[model samples]
Target chain A: PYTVVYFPVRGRCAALRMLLADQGQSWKEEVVTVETWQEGSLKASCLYGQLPKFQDGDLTLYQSNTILRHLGRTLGLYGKDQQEAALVDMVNDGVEDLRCKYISLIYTNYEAGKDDYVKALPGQLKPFETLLSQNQGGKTFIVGDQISFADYNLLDLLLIHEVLAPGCLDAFPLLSAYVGRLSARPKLKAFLASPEYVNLPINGNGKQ
Target chain B: MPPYTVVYFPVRGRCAALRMLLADQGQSWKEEVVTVETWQEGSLKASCLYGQLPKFQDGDLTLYQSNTILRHLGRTLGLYGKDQQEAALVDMVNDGVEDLRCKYISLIYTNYEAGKDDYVKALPGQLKPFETLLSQNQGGKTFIVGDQISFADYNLLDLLLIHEVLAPGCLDAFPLLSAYVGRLSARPKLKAFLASPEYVNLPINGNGKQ
Candidate 1:
């Protein structure tokens, strides 16, 4: 069993949550509340002052992507071989670059920076669309066909971006189709509709 | 190890840490530096996986993302760590290093004028965690996580080195990191490589201001 300690918001952990859910892994979350977070000790005590800390058996881990990669490593979701693994990392890093910019816009300058961010959204998303297009017509997974962990991260990034700017994915046909295809996985579909995800806002600031 | 090739601008930039790791491990490889005039030729840039530099080719396997290159090299060279859990700790350490390196890069490129004071002011809190890791380990004695030098230490060492350049004596407050940088820099091959023209002459980044 695994235990993920994070805030109630689905910010960084959403993709990891999607991966665990879709993989049919049984794990529990130790949700940190707003009240408790404000107390400041947990934040200070954190290794890097962030959440999505994970525990697999006695080994606890930090860095949300590290947790994702741990699950990917242990669960046989990394990919077929070294090349696929590199591709997986490449795709994950690309997702992360955009995700960081998205978070920065939301937290730092949501009101003033919103317009410029949305304007440049297409250029930001083009690489992923090109990535998907290169791989099996974007019909399968992000990298190759076997549904690697990058698929989960890409799915969540597309989901959150859509929420951040509604219809934002419409410009890219492959990414748009990729979103629907991954979101429709039975276990993931159920997870997305779960009250746990629906009740909480995507971000703490209530932006998206 | 299969022959490896790294394609990037002549500057060290993202490839510095990986090169340091390769040198520290005594592994040999070929460097394919991209010049601004050659990059302007446009063929390699267009053919790149993610349209970025620091591309790595290990025989048939081609990879991008500098950290990806580090992790791959670590796994292949037995520099990742002793075991799976240790590997995760290494990953955590690398991730932290990457986070700070990104901030440092942003400051170097975009915010040095106005954000320098605030960035330096918060530097200790930003850096203290690594010291904490050192404290919890062998009383700030060994490498970052374990006695063995994982891939992260090289990256962390480079991050610390550049930060010292950005803010002289910045690590003085953190005795562990200050000493850690000194210790890593003392490695024979790494010391020689650090002083080599290939590593020294190249700007830390392509921006040229550094």
Candidate 2:
């Protein structure tokens, strides 16, 4: 029973929760309130000086991607083979880049120059679309025709953009459909509708 | 006999760091350069959307992230670590540098803008922790871990040199790191490699140093 502490929002902390949820692993999600985050054990004793920290008994970890990979490997969701694992990693890194760019635009109020940023994303999306298309081999998953970490990541990212930036998937239809298929999974479907799942803003819209 | 190719700009850009690591391990590879004109055309845009260089290809495998590529190369070369926990530590240190590198590189390449001011103000604070780590490891040894060079060493060396290249006296504040970089640079092979034609062309500015 690991304890995950993070902000209630679906920011950097959502990936690990989605992975855990996909695995049906029962754990605690300790949402950090403004007051709690500032004064809790995280502020008192955590290394790396940031949030979205995980504590497995006494072994504490920081960095969202590191935690995701650690949990993915622990739960056997990363991949079946080394190459597949690398591919999962590659996709996750790609998502990380996109998320960073999205953050830069939103946080910096680069909306006036949004066109340049938005235009650059579709081209990047095409690779993942192609990867999903090929991995599916016309089947249904991104890696090995099974539900791996890559699949969960792909679905989570799609949902993130869909909820936060509605038209983000408009150009990449294959990826869009892939997310739909992934979200339809029984466990994931249940998790998405669960009360604990936080509904966040999508590009200033207050919809979940 | 892994079937693949690394594609990037003619200059080292991001890929060269990994290339040097691979070359040090005697891995045979082919260099595929994406021209400047082609970059603006978005030829490799699908591979990396962050709009950066150093995309890797191996057999049917194509990866776009630089640190991810470094991790793979480090593992393949046996330069990472012997145990899973050790490997994780290596990764922790390696990945920790990304934010620092982002700040450092912005100052060098992008003309030290507002971001640069923020980075400069913030870097000394960030580097103090690393200085402590280096001091702890400095028990009459040259590298971060044991005697032999590891991915950690390569990364530290690359970061140190890149910072020095950008701002010549920037590292003077941290003497242990400066000494570590100097020792690593003095390795026979590394020293020779540093003097090579390819290394000479790297975009480094000299500040009143002979």
Candidate 3:
């Protein structure tokens, strides 16, 4: 039994939990309270000295993307081959960049250029929509016919956007539908319905 | 036999390092250029998680982000290193590239008015770390690692080229870096590629002289 430790809040570790749940793997979700997170070993383990570190048995891993890849591979969710795995990583990196930009707009440039910030989002959406469109040549999932880490990651990011910036998905209907289809997975649906998957406020900041 | 498509804007922004790594491996890759006009139309979100360029589609798996793509490619193509420590060193050097590149971009876009003052201010503090790393192995080998060319070497060469193109005299102060760049540039394949149209398409911007 592996003990997974993170802040109870769905800040950066939500995707890990979701990934774990999607695989139906049993593990302990050790929730570190705000005070504990501030004082405990959580802060000591991060590579960039940030949150969302994971401890697998005795081995500790930092960098959420690295952990995601590790878990994806351990759970047999990465891809069929090295190339396929690289592709999954590529999409994951893309999502991270977009998420960073979005966060910057919301947190750093909220007042300076809110309109431009929101306007610029649609430009970002176009690339993803095109990717989804091309990937869906005949398959239902983004990566392949079967669900891989990329599909789950796609779902996670989409849901985050939908929750953070309402109406952002309107321009990308294919992606919107893709999220809907992914969420419809039996285990995934249950996971989303659970309290663990609920969207939390960003850094306790009020809803954007 | 895998179909690999690297989608991004045609310019050598983030994807150039990955392109160089692939080219070094002699891997057959398809460059899918996303036009700025098409990007504005809002239809390609699924290619990336949050919707960014430099996405790699290999069969069914799709990934985006330049460094991530480079790391994956480096690992698979024998460009990273053989062991964990070596890989970490490679990563450190790569991260240094990212940091300096970001600062260099800021100098170009944000502080161009400052001109050489900006480069002088940044190079000593921001870029010197890489200079020290290059000088570590007595500056004898052509590559960062022992003998073989790692991804870091190509990245360093490309980064130096970009700096030279963007800020002409940026490397004037760092003799080690200047010599290292010269040595790396002399490689047959690298020299050929640098001389090619794809690498020289933009001409020398020459310190933001529009």
Compute the lDDT for candidate 1. 0.87
TM-score order of candidates, top first: 1, 2, 3
Worst 10 residues of 3 chain A by lDDT: A199-208
Candidate 1 collision pairs? none
TM-score of each: 0.93, 0.83, 0.64
Best by lDDT: 1
Compare the candidates by DockQ and give the number of the best one. 1
lDDT, each prediction? 0.87, 0.67, 0.67
Candidate 3: tens digits of C-alpha lDDT, residues B1-210: 547788877677666666666765667778777886888887885434655676786566566667777777776778876654455456556756765666666666667777657565656555566676667655844566555677877777778878776658778888888888888777776677667787667333334342
DockQ of structure 1: 0.66
By DockQ: ranked, best first: 1, 2, 3
User: What C-alpha lDDT, on a 0 to 100 scale, does residue B96 get in candidate 2?
Assistant: 60
Candidate 2 lDDT over B1-210, as tens digits, reads 545577766655465567667655656677776776888887566446345766777775667788778876765667766655555556555666666666565565666555555665666666654565567555525566544566766776677677665456667888887788778777766676677776666444222211
lDDT of 1 by residue, A78-177 (tens): 8788778788888899888889999999898899999999999887788888888988888888887788888888888888888878999988999988
Q: What residue pairs are clashing in model 2?
A: A136-A139, A164-A202, B3-B59, B4-B59
Question: Considering every candidate listed, which one attains the maximal TM-score?
Answer: 1
Task: Please write out the lDDT profile of model 1 over residues B1-210, one tens digit for every residue.
Answer: 549998888888899999999988888889877788888888887777667888898897888899999988887787888977788899899999999999988987897789898998989889998999998889989999888999999999999888888789989999999889999999999999999998998898778745
* Native contacts recovered by model 1: 0.60
